[PDB]
Design a protein around this ligand. Structure first.
Ligand SMILES: Nc1nc2c(ncn2[C@@H]2O[C@H](COP(=O)(O)OP(=O)(O)NP(=O)(O)O)[C@@H](O)[C@H]2O)c(=O)[nH]1
Ligand SMILES: Nc1ncnc2c1ncn2[C@@H]1O[C@H](COP(=O)(O)OP(=O)(O)OP(=O)(O)O)[C@@H](O)[C@H]1O
Ligand SMILES: [Mg+2]
Ligand SMILES: [Mg+2]
Ligand SMILES: [Mg+2]
Lengths: 51, 132, 101, 80, 208, 352
C-alpha cells in the first residue's frame, strides 16, 4: 500500500538504521528477536535464582 | 485590553477546571477553545453551566473561557460549574454571594469513588453468602 | 543442603538449561522461519528433540528460595507469601509497609 | 508522486488544471480568442486564487481561510 | 456519607432569597441568620434553579433509569412529552370549535393529572396479631401514594405484552389513557381498592 | 404576525424579509418537496398544519447568485457549510423552491449518505461488470424525480437508443418519461435509468432546452468511504457504485445552462468526527479537488433577530405550552441551552 518512492525510501532508511532490508514475513522475524536478546535460561535471574 | 475579569478553579471527582469570567460579555462560554454547546452535547451538562448565572439573574452578561481535564462528561460540567460560580462571586453583591453559598453553588462536592476492598465484590457489594 | 529434593531437582534443571541454552537457541532459529527448506527444518526438529529433557526451560519452576514452596511466590523477592510476610511484618524489608487507603 | 509530497504545490495540480479549463470555457462563451495560458495564469486574480488554495492545503483550515478562498473564486468566475 | 452531620441540604429557590426583609417574621429572620453559620452541601447535578424544572418528572425519569444511563432515560422522557403533545395537537385540529375547548395540549398538565388518577387511597399492610400476619387496610402516606402511581405506570410499560413498541409510544399512550381514567394502570388501582374493601373486617387491627 | 411575511414568492424575498417566515403552499410541498425536507421539519408541518420557512441571509445570498446566473458560462458550484443543525438543508430547500417556481428542471438528491450505507440488495451491474447497482435506492429516487419534474418529462426526449434487454429498448426521440418509467417498473433497470437521466439532462441543458438545478444534500458522501461490503466481506469504494459514479459527473463544471448547489452534512456521514464541518474536513482531499473552484456559503446560528422571530412563530402556533416559556426569563434559558442553534432550539421546544 506504498508508492514506489515511499517503498524505496523505506528500504533506504532500513539500511542506514541497520534494520532488516529484505522482505521478511512475521514468522521469519522471530529469528531476529531470538538473537537480539539473551535466552531466558541465560538471564542471571534464571540460573542464579537460588542462593 | 483593559477588560476586567476574575479567575477561579473547581474540582469534581477526578475533573479539574479553571474558569476566567469577564465582567462584561454577551454570554459566550468557551470550553478548551470550543463553544459550550459543541463541547457539552448532553443537555444536562449545559443546564449545569446555566445554574450559576441564572441563579443570580446574569444570563447573557458575561463571557467565560474555561479549561477542564480529567473525569467524565458530567464531572467536567460539575467542575466548570464550581469554577464559574467562584469567579462570578467577584461581580455580585455580598448578599448575592451568601445566597449562592446557601444554594450549594460554592461547595466542593466531596463524593469521590470508594476503593474496592479485598474479600468482597465491590466497595460495599459483598460476595454471595453461599447457600447453606 | 538445599531445602528438599524438589528444590535440588530444580537446581539441576537450571544448571542444565544454562549449559544447553546456546545450542537450543541456534537449533530453534533454524525451525522458526519460512526461509530454510523443510528438509533442513525437519532435521532440526529431531535434533532439538534429542537433547536432554532437563535442558528445556519450560520445566524450570520458580520456587521459594527459603522454603521451596512452588506456588504463592513473589518474583521480585523470590519468597513465598508466608516467608515474605514474616520478614515484612518484622520491619526487615526496606521500605515495605502495610497498605491502608 | 503528489501523494509523497508533504507540502502542497499549486503548479501542475488539479487546482491549476481545473481553474484553467474553466477560464477557457468562459472565454469561449464570450467568443474571445485570447486563449494564451501565460496570459490567463498571469493576472492578479489567479495569484490571489493560488495564494488561497495553498493556504487551505498547507495551513490549518479555518473560517478566515475559507472566506479568503471564497472572494478569490468569485472574482475569477465573475460572481458579484 | 462523605458529608459530616453538620452539612445542611442546599435550598435552590430564587424566590426564597429575593423575598424582602419586611415580609419576614421573627422566626424566618432567625433561620436566615442561622444558615449564615452552617455548612451547605454542594448542589447535586440533578436539580437547578431553572424555570422549566419539574421535580415529579425528574423523579419519574430516575425510576426509568437502567444501570445509571440517565441520558437514555432523559431521552425517553422528552420523547414521551413530545409524543403526548403531538397527539393532542392532532386531536385538537381534528375537533370542532366546541370540543376544542376541552382538549388539553400541555403535556405537563396531562402527566401530573394522569399520575394523580392512578394514586391509590388505601393499601394493605401486614399487621401481626396473635402470632399471625393479616393484610389490614390502612391509609397510605402521600409519599407512598405517589411512588406506587409511578411504579405501576413504569411496570406496565415494561410488560412484555407490548410487542416491538418503543417506550415513548407506549408511555404516551398509557398517560393519555390514565388522563381519562382508563387503561390497565387505573385497573390496578381499582384492584387494590377492591382487595382492601374485601378485608374491611380486619381494619380494626390498626392502632394508629 | 410579527414573525410572518405575506410575500410567498421566493423570487421577491430580500434583506427586508430576513427573520420572517414565508408560507409554502400545500401544492408545492407535494410537487416540489416529495423528499429533502428534514425529518423533524416534516413532523412540524404535520403538527402545525402548515409549512413556513424563515428567510435568512444564507439563502438570500444564494438566491442573489442564482438570479444573476450567466447560463452561457459553465455551471457554478455553490457549497453550503456550517455547524450541525444550523439550517444547511432548509437553506438549500428555499433555493430549490425558487428554481422550481422559475420553471427550472430540479435534480434533487435529498441525502447522498443513503447511497453508501445500509444496502441490502447490492447487485452487480450488467452494463459494466465492474460496478454495482442499487435498485432500491435508485427506484426510490426515480419516483420522487418523476413527481417534481412531471410536467417536463414529456417535452424532453432522448437523443440516443438505450438497450435494456434483448427485447426491450428505448428508441431515439422517445420522451424521457419512458426512461423513468422503465426504471420504476423494472427495478433491475433503475440504476441504469438514473444514469441515463443524468446523461440526458446534462446534455440537453447545454443545448438550451431548459435550465437545470443540481441539488445534492450531503455531497461529502461521493468522495468518502462506504460501509458496503462484497460477498468476500471486502470494502467497496464509492467509484464502484453506479449511482455515485454517475452523480460525480453532474458535479463537474463541464456543462452550462444551470447551477450546482450542494450542502455538506456530518449527520449520517461515515468515518467523520462529530464536530467536523469545514469543507476540506468533510470533503477530504479527493472531494475538495472534484469541486474546486467552488463558492462556499456559511450557515450559522440564529442571530438575535432570527431567534426572537423563531420563538414568536412557535408561540403563534401555541407550540410552547409551558406557562413560563413566553416570559422573558423563559426565553433566556431557551437561548442559553441552545446557544441560538436552530436544531437544538427546535428539539427543546418540542417537549416544552
Ligand atoms: N442499460 C443501459 N444503461 C445505459 C445505456 N447507456 C447509458 N447507460 C447508463 O448511463 C450511464 C452513463 O452513460 P455513459 O456516459 O454512456 O456511460 P459510460 O460509458 O459508463 N461512461 P464512462 O466512461 O464515463 O464510465 C452508464 O453508466 C449506464 O449506467 C444503455 O444503452 N443501456
Ligand atoms: N430556515 C429555517 N426555517 C425554519 N426552521 C429552520 C430553518 N433553518 C433551520 N430551522 C430549524 O432547524 C432545524 C435543522 O435544520 P436543517 O436540518 O436544515 O439543518 P442542517 O444544518 O442542514 O442540519 P444537519 O447538520 O443535521 O445536516 C430544522 O428542522 C428547523 O427546526
Ligand atoms: Mg457493582
Ligand atoms: Mg511453569
Ligand atoms: Mg442537513
Amino acid at each position: 500500500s506504498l508508492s514506489e518512492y515511499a517503498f524505496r525510501m523505506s528500504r533506504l532508511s532500513a539500511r542506514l538504521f541497520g534494520e532488516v532490508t529484505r522482505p521478511t514475513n512475521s514468522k521469519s522475524m522471530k529469528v531476529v528477536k531470538l538473537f537480539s536478546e539473551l535466552p531466558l535460561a541465560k538471564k542471571k535471574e534464571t540460573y542464579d535464582w537460588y542462593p | 485590553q483593559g477588560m476586567a475579569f476574575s479567575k477561579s478553579e473547581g474540582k469534581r471527582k477526578t475533573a479539574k477546571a479553571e474558569a476566567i469570567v469577564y465582567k462584561h460579555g454577551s454570554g459566550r462560554i468557551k470550553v478548551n477553545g470550543i463553544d459550550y454547546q459543541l463541547y457539552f452535547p448532553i443537555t444536562q451538562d449545559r443546564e449545569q453551566l446555566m445554574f450559576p448565572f441564572h441563579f443570580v439573574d446574569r444570563l447573557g452578561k458575561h463571557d467565560v473561557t474555561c479549561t477542564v481535564s480529567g473525569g467524565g462528561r458530567s464531572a467536567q460540567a460539575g467542575a466548570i460549574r464550581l469554577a464559574m460560580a467562584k469567579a462570578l462571586c467577584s461581580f455580585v453583591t455580598e448578599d448575592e454571594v451568601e445566597w449562592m453559598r446557601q444554594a450549594g453553588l460554592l461547595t466542593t462536592d466531596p463524593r469521590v469513588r470508594e476503593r474496592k476492598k479485598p474479600g468482597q465484590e465491590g466497595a460495599r457489594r459483598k460476595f454471595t453468602w453461599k447457600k447453606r | 543442603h538445599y531445602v528438599d529434593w524438589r528444590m535440588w531437582r530444580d537446581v539441576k534443571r537450571r544448571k542444565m538449561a544454562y549449559e544447553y541454552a546456546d545450542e537450543r537457541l541456534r537449533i530453534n532459529s533454524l525451525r522458526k522461519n519460512t526461509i530454510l527448506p523443510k528438509i533442513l527444518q525437519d532435521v532440526a526438529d529431531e535434533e532439538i528433540a534429542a537433547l536432554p529433557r532437563d535442558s528445556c526451560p519450560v520445566r524450570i519452576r520458580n520456587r521459594c528460595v527459603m522454603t521451596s514452596r512452588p506456588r504463592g511466590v513473589k518474583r521480585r523477592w523470590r519468597l513465598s507469601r508466608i516467608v515474605f510476610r514474616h520478614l515484612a511484618d518484622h520491619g526487615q524489608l526496606s521500605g515495605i509497609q502495610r497498605a491502608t487507603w | 508522486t503528489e501523494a509523497d509530497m508533504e507540502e502542497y504545490i499549486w503548479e501542475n495540480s488539479s487546482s491549476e488544471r481545473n481553474i484553467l479549463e474553466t477560464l477557457l470555457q468562459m472565454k469561449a462563451a464570450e467568443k474571445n480568442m485570447e486563449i494564451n495560458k501565460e496570459e490567463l495564469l498571469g493576472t492578479k486574480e489567479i495569484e490571489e486564487y493560488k495564494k488561497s488554495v495553498v493556504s487551505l492545503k498547507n495551513e490549518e483550515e479555518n473560517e478566515n481561510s475559507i472566506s479568503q478562498y471564497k472572494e478569490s473564486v468569485k472574482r475569477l468566475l465573475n460572481v458579484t | 456519607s462523605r458529608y459530616s452531620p453538620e452539612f445542611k441540604d442546599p435550598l435552590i429557590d430564587k424566590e426564597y432569597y429575593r423575598k424582602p426583609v419586611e415580609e419576614l417574621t421573627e422566626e424566618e429572620k432567625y433561620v436566615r441568620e442561622l444558615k449564615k453559620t452552617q455548612l451547605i452541601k454542594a448542589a447535586p447535578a440533578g436539580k437547578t434553579s431553572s424555570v422549566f424544572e419539574d421535580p415529579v418528572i425528574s423523579k419519574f425519569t430516575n425510576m426509568m433509569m437502567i444501570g445509571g444511563n440517565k441520558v437514555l432515560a432523559r431521552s425517553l422522557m422528552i420523547q414521551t412529552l413530545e409524543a403526548v403533545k403531538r397527539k393532542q395537537f392532532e386531536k385538537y385540529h381534528a375537533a370542532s370549535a366546541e370540543e376544542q375547548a376541552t382538549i388539553e395540549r400541555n403535556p405537563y398538565t396531562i402527566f401530573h393529572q394522569a399520575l394523580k388518577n392512578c394514586e391509590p387511597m388505601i393499601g394493605l399492610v401486614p399487621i401481626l396479631k396473635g402470632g399471625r400476619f393479616y393484610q389490614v387496610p390502612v391509609p397510605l402516606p402521600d409519599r407512598r401514594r405517589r411512588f406506587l402511581a409511578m411504579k405501576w405506570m413504569i411496570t406496565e410499560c415494561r410488560d412484555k405484552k407490548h410487542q416491538r413498541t418503543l417506550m415513548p409510544e407506549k408511555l404516551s399512550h398509557k398517560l393519555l389513557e390514565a388522563f381519562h381514567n382508563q387503561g390497565p394502570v387505573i385497573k390496578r388501582k381499582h384492584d387494590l381498592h377492591k382487595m382492601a374493601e374485601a378485608n374491611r373486617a380486619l381494619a380494626h387491627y390498626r392502632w394508629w | 404576525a410579527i414573525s410572518r411575511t405575506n410575500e410567498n414568492d421566493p423570487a421577491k424575498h430580500g434583506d427586508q424579509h430576513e427573520g420572517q417566515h414565508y408560507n409554502i403552499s400545500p401544492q408545492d410541498l407535494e410537487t416540489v418537496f416529495p423528499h429533502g425536507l428534514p425529518p423533524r421539519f416534516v413532523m412540524q408541518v404535520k403538527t402545525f398544519s402548515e409549512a413556513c420557512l424563515m428567510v435568512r441571509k444564507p439563502a438570500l445570498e444564494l438566491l442573489h447568485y442564482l438570479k444573476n446566473t450567466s447560463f452561457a458560462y459553465p455551471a457554478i458550484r455553490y457549497l453550503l457549510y456550517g455547524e450541525k443543525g444550523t439550517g444547511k438543508t432548509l437553506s438549500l430547500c428555499h433555493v430549490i423552491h425558487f428554481c422550481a417556481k422559475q420553471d427550472w428542471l430540479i435534480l434533487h438528491i435529498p441525502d447522498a449518505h443513503l447511497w453508501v450505507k445500509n444496502c441490502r440488495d447490492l447487485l452487480q451491474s450488467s452494463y459494466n461488470k465492474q460496478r454495482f447497482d442499487q435498485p432500491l435506492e435508485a427506484s426510490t429516487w426515480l419516483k420522487n424525480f418523476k413527481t417534481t419534474n412531471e410536467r417536463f418529462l414529456n417535452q424532453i426526449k432522448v437523443q440516443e437508443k438505450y438497450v435494456w434487454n434483448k427485447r426491450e429498448s428505448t428508441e431515439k426521440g422517445s420522451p424521457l418519461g419512458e426512461v423513468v418509467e422503465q426504471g420504476i417498473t423494472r427495478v433491475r433497470n433503475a440504476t441504469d435509468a438514473v444514469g441515463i437521466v443524468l446523461k440526458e439532462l446534462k446534455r440537453q441543458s447545454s443545448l438550451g432546452m431548459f435550465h437545470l438545478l443540481v441539488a445534492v444534500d450531503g455531497i461529502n458522501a461521493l468522495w468518502g468511504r462506504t460501509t458496503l461490503k462484497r460477498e468476500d466481506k471486502s470494502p467497496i469504494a464509492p467509484e464502484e457504485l453506479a449511482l455515485v459514479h454517475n452523480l460525480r459527473k453532474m458535479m463537474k463544471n463541464d456543462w452550462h445552462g444551470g447551477a450546482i448547489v450542494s450542502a455538506l452534512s456530518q449527520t449520517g456521514s461515515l468515518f467523520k468526527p462529530r464536530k467536523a464541518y469545514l469543507p476540506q474536513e468533510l470533503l477530504g482531499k479527493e472531494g475538495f479537488d472534484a469541486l474546486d473552484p467552488f463558492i462556499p456559503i456559511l450557515v450559522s446560528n440564529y442571530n438575535p433577530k432570527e431567534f426572537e422571530s423563531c420563538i414568536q412563530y412557535y408561540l403563534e402556533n401555541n407550540w410552547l405550552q409551558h406557562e413560563k416559556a413566553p416570559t422573558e426569563e423563559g426565553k433566556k434559558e431557551l437561548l442559553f441551552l441552545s446557544n441560538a442553534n436552530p436544531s437544538l432550539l427546535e428539539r427543546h421546544c418540542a417537549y416544552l
